[PDB]
Write a protein that binds this ligand. Sequence first.
Ligand SMILES: N[C@@H](Cc1c[nH]c2ccccc12)C(=O)O
Ligand SMILES: [K+]
Length: 528
Amino acid sequence: DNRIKTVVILGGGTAGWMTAAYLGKALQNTVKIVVLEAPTIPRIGVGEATVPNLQRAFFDYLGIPEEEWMRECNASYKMAVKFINWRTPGEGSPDPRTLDDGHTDTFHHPFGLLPSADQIPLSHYWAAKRLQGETDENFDEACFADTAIMNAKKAPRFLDMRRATNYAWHFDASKVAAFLRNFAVTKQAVEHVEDEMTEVLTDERGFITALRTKSGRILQGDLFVDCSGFRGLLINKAMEEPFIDMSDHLLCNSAVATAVPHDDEKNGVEPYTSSIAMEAGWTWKIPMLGRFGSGHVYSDHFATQDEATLAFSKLWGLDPDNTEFNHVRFRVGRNRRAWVRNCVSVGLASCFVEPLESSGIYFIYAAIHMLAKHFPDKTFDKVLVDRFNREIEEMFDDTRDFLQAHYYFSPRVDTPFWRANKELKLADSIKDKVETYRAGLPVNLPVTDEGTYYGNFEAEFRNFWTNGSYYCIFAGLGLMPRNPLPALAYKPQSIAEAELLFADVKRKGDTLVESLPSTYDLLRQLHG
Ligand SMILES: N[C@@H](Cc1c[nH]c2ccccc12)C(=O)O
Ligand SMILES: [K+]
């Protein structure tokens, strides 16, 4: 019997407690699971955003109903990330400026998959019309009914909880953590040890045998999961695995954040996350129940903590002398390997990017998912570890490339930050995709319906940023194909078919704006 008998997880928060809860279920009570979590002074909830797979892939697997966890964590609803002022120069403002062409400088990145006609995504029909002056509609409004719903701040479900669209979640991460801790301990026989780690004990081959706590207690184990955050106490310090810094792709490295009380009854609640462009980065806005989380992500090469804190306060008209701010310095990049010997990194300790496209919890989920599938025995087969490592690095680099694209193809050059972004080099694979897009071809074409895509994690994992997401961002920022897909010039029936799709999107949006409750009302209904 060469089986792992004990798993020790260093660190709590979302990474630790998602890991504990997930492996709790996956390992079917054959393995003891211990979490060693430093107790800390609970910081203010600056808000986290997620992607739609979270309920099916994670909470449904644990048997936790959506309303149960949402009610505990003050969760709200997300239908997109909405980008504001990424094309126009100026001070940071919550209000969108106007483009040269008269359009408002906003664009959406909603969920779901684009419909197709004659096996060609709606995006391409839109682009054919836009390039030839047959439409002045933006890509997002023409191709996603969700755009209309969001503009009127309506909910993704009706008041009887009938689904109208795809959505994900906004929530306070520490609340989800507390909830999962509670779940894992009471329901799954996970042991919680509230203490700090002082020693990492290793055998002759450099495999971890145990952690010592600050109280002297030794926690023996066979597999160790590093959820220690940015310090990477196991993977980087103890195992000495180098972190690959990727600040030559993404300049932002700091954040200042707070929670802002909000008159929901008065203003409504946005069913989306906003990315508000600033002079030296951007600011998130994550509406929750009664408050929104916000954080100004910035490069400290281009702004001091005071400068950034001042500009951020100014967005919302905060008193910086009378406001509670969390300041964070980020690691941006990933370990050379996520898993070395019998030490597996998950979360911040593995890798990180700014939450520009809500990567944080997805990255955690993907790791634990891949860990359960690549779960080892005590012989730690080199191939098993290698394939796991391979998935994390492809996952990471791919999302990295996608985020750089947001900065690289921004037309802004008004501050040294925005100028500096146009000096960085793109990786080959995102260059390749830009080339493909620009010839009018789809990038990462969806080959699946939504049911399959959001019902089977592995389907989404192999095609995470689809053609639709590429169109949302490139087109959103003003990057268009050089020309339409040439096949379209030969396909009048197919063009007619696409007109019907365009009309279905208008009709759905109009009908659903008319009949849907406000996001605000749906929240009241849910949290009553
Ligand atoms: N795989 C994600 C892609 C996605 C689309 N829009 C997004 C906005 C934010 C983050 C991710 C996304 C999904 O379909 O859910
Ligand atoms: K051991």
